[PDB]
Design an enzyme around this catalytic site. Structure first.
Site, PDB file in Angstrom:
ATOM      1  CG  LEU D  16       9.817  -2.274 -51.631  1.00 31.72           C
ATOM      2  CD1 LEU D  16       9.343  -0.938 -52.154  1.00 31.72           C
ATOM      3  CD2 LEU D  16      11.346  -2.336 -51.613  1.00 31.72           C
ATOM      4  N   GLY D  17       9.956  -3.223 -47.332  1.00 34.46           N
ATOM      5  CA  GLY D  17       9.736  -3.041 -45.906  1.00 34.46           C
ATOM      6  C   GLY D  17       9.077  -4.167 -45.126  1.00 34.46           C
ATOM      7  CG  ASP D  62      -3.777  -1.153 -57.223  1.00 30.37           C
ATOM      8  OD1 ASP D  62      -4.399  -1.181 -56.141  1.00 30.37           O
ATOM      9  OD2 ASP D  62      -3.342  -0.092 -57.722  1.00 30.37           O
ATOM     10  CE1 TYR D 155      -1.909   4.386 -43.395  1.00 28.37           C
ATOM     11  CE2 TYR D 155      -1.875   4.686 -40.995  1.00 28.37           C
ATOM     12  CZ  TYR D 155      -1.471   3.991 -42.135  1.00 28.37           C
ATOM     13  OH  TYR D 155      -0.608   2.924 -42.026  1.00 28.37           O
TER      14      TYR D 155
END
Ligand SMILES: [Mg+2]
Ligand SMILES: [Mg+2]
Lengths: 251, 251, 251, 251
Positions: D16-17, D62, D155
């Site tokens: 994705l993206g 993962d 983050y």
């Protein structure tokens, strides 16, 4: 007190704002000080407001004036003995984008902000090296030395130059054991004449989006970091950049 | 191929080494190129070695020459149409510490390395803005713009200035939707003709303590990153610094 | 003297080297201090060598121990009153490249160097905010937070995390007017107990190619900068990085 | 076309993206691609939407799963031959300040953003070294790796760690002539599926005070810089940081 015991410092543009604060704290810490500026009138009064001739004096000088630099060092040394500390704080700003900067404005700002700092740093190394003075050269930069501003083109260039040029000088002094350290101070927006000359600058830079703390600093904020860099407390600090911007460059 | 389709570029100092490589790759990618330098002898010969007049041409010019910049843009636009890309690569170096740098050396190096880039960038913005060209200004800096070198005082200064001045220009262009991007490229040691004429130069530069990879780069290493920055592939990159130094600044 | 008047500080890993120096200077500046470590013997002996129980005390604690952090703040507050200063200095190192780092080593180093600093910073903000204490959190980083080292993979990671994580905390505190500042200190090679246990370590560190000054620093070099950051002298400094590395990162 | 001829790449979070864009451009440039995702709901649909099995495939994995990494490399090598390129793009975010971050959120985010990148980088070096592949490891970072954000504590930490850890790896590989380069990409705000789900997200990110260009980027903006870093065009670039943020960090 006495954190600058025995030191003999020269502070360009030390008759007002930041320069004046640094001079005040330096003398307060036991250092002999010589402040400079292009206006003798205010100069004399500034020095006297800080202390007596035996602790601080004034010397009319334009940092962009190369020859004057030698005379400035001779007068300071003649009055207090060998200079051990130099603070290149004198500087000017132009509210213009790179696109709208005239060549005259460009050369004028670099003459003071860049050539002037170069002249002081060069002479400072030659005069303060190898004398066991614990010499320290503090080159006043700015947050504008780390990030750009759309309306401070010339300023940004001069501040970025001082930033890296200082590292070069720091390395050469260290590698040759000149007993001279060189570091830069990067004030964020501070309540001073340069800022109170920039239309609506203080209001704009007080916005949380500019300065996270929601307010700009004061002259003493820069004076205290300069005391540290001038004192032997930072004998292992050289070629480094010290920022005091209320979080401006943190975001 | 065609990563620079429709682009019209100006490359100062594009008759040799890095500049020549950038010009070669640019033409190779479909861009019309105008290379400059004060030596027409090698300049005109260089253009022809890269391609025909319809794809690349030479224009004698000194980047420090302000008035010449306008003539340079007019000639390029008259030959290939509106300029959309500018690479400020022309520069000189002085092997002197800040302490031993003469004022003549200082002014001479800044005239090319700083004033020249300023002149190009300023005029570039005025000429390339608001024309849907996907304009890009690539200011050649150096690793000497991030870190200092004891023997490159003046050089360090000019590179530090270009580094931050470019961010200022990048911001103004973006904020005003000028359709002009401004970024800096920071090459590490590069094997060039000049480098080969200095006995032991590449040798010292290749030392692990200096360049981790154990060897310096080649002109194409800088040309490839410039292609990326000149193309619409980097339409979202502005005000950034791109380093290609073999790990020099990683340690 | 009294540059930290009324301050109540917690220093993790303050029983030896840098930590012990910071504690010594802090008490000397009028601050109440609580040092921590895992060795009660060395700990108690350390606190008493610095001062009496009314000025400094010891608290056995592992910075990686989350629950212990709350007990550490309670004991400190109970002894000297509300904590106003926190120095996250405790940390460990692994001499391994990223390629040769085991997951166990990786997790073990991050537990102390990263999680530990996170725990202290998080709790520090919650406990020291909105109390008019002029709270300050000093997160001990390293030059390894700016540049990498082929043999300090895990270490580099933890120091890089602390560097940026601190800026986040600094911004949040400033934007919310928590009266809490957060900054990082980045020491270069310092003559610490560990360094003296590794034959030839100080030698490699002192190589001009590594530390331009030709020698590493001493614990007090870091203590002095910590005093400045803990005092109200730096009330406008937040989210900044203060380097004291003898020129290491200047080149 | 064929700028990645012969290359065999692994892209984590490539379904994705940004990850999907990188995969698309990579295949488009002649590289064989294996895209991973923690989930498998679109893995097959994603790979197939980019190309046929001979050019791109999907592997459920993962990034925080250490053992899985070995299976990922074996599957990729078994399908396309020795891996030469690794793009650590998979990551997650938590909208919490450092003060309000739970230990669970902290560990969870680091497991993917830090541990995962570490696992991939470590195994990557071991598997791609000394094989004449022109190996390249691209560690996806962020502007949050240069500056902090009050609501991205964890983050910020993980991105700062990846930033410096990558330099360590880059140095070791270069110094040991592993024929493996390691660089980081720091995207600014990018229009991704996740962003479209957060009302007013693109609006807040498009504020001039945040992104000077007045709009965020698109996935291809990151894919293009990744192509450059994956190709032999950047054979002299290692340990560097490449920013594409629309001017975010320029101010
Ligand atoms: Mg370095
Ligand atoms: Mg910023």
């Amino acid at each position: 007190s006495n954190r600058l015991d025995g030191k003999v410092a020269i502070i360009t543009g030390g008759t007002l704002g930041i320069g004046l604060a640094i001079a005040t704290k330096f003398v307060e810490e036991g250092a002999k000080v010589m402040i400079t500026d292009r206006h003798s009138d205010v100069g004399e009064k500034a020095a006297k407001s800080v202390g007596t001739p035996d602790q601080i004096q004034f010397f009319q000088h334009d940092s962009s004036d190369e020859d004057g630099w030698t005379k400035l060092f001779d007068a300071t040394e003649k009055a207090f003995g060998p200079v051990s500390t130099l603070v290149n704080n004198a500087g000017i700003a132009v509210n213009k984008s790179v696109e709208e900067t005239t060549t005259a404005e460009w050369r004028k700002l670099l003459a003071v902000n860049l050539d002037g700092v170069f002249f002081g740093t060069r002479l400072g190394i030659q005069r303060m090296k190898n004398k066991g003075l614990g010499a320290s050269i503090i080159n006043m930069s700015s947050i504008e030395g780390f990030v750009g501003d759309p309306s401070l083109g010339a300023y940004n260039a001069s501040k970025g130059a001082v930033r890296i040029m200082s590292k070069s000088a720091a390395l050469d002094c260290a590698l040759k054991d000149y007993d001279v350290r060189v570091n830069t101070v990067h004030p964020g927006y501070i309540k001073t004449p340069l800022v109170d000359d920039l239309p609506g600058a203080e209001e704009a830079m007080s916005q949380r989006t500019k300065t996270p703390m929601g307010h700009i600093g004061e002259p003493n904020d820069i004076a205290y970091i300069c005391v540290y860099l001038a004192s032997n407390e930072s004998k292992f600090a050289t070629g480094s950049e010290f920022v005091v911007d209320g979080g401006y460059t943190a975001q």
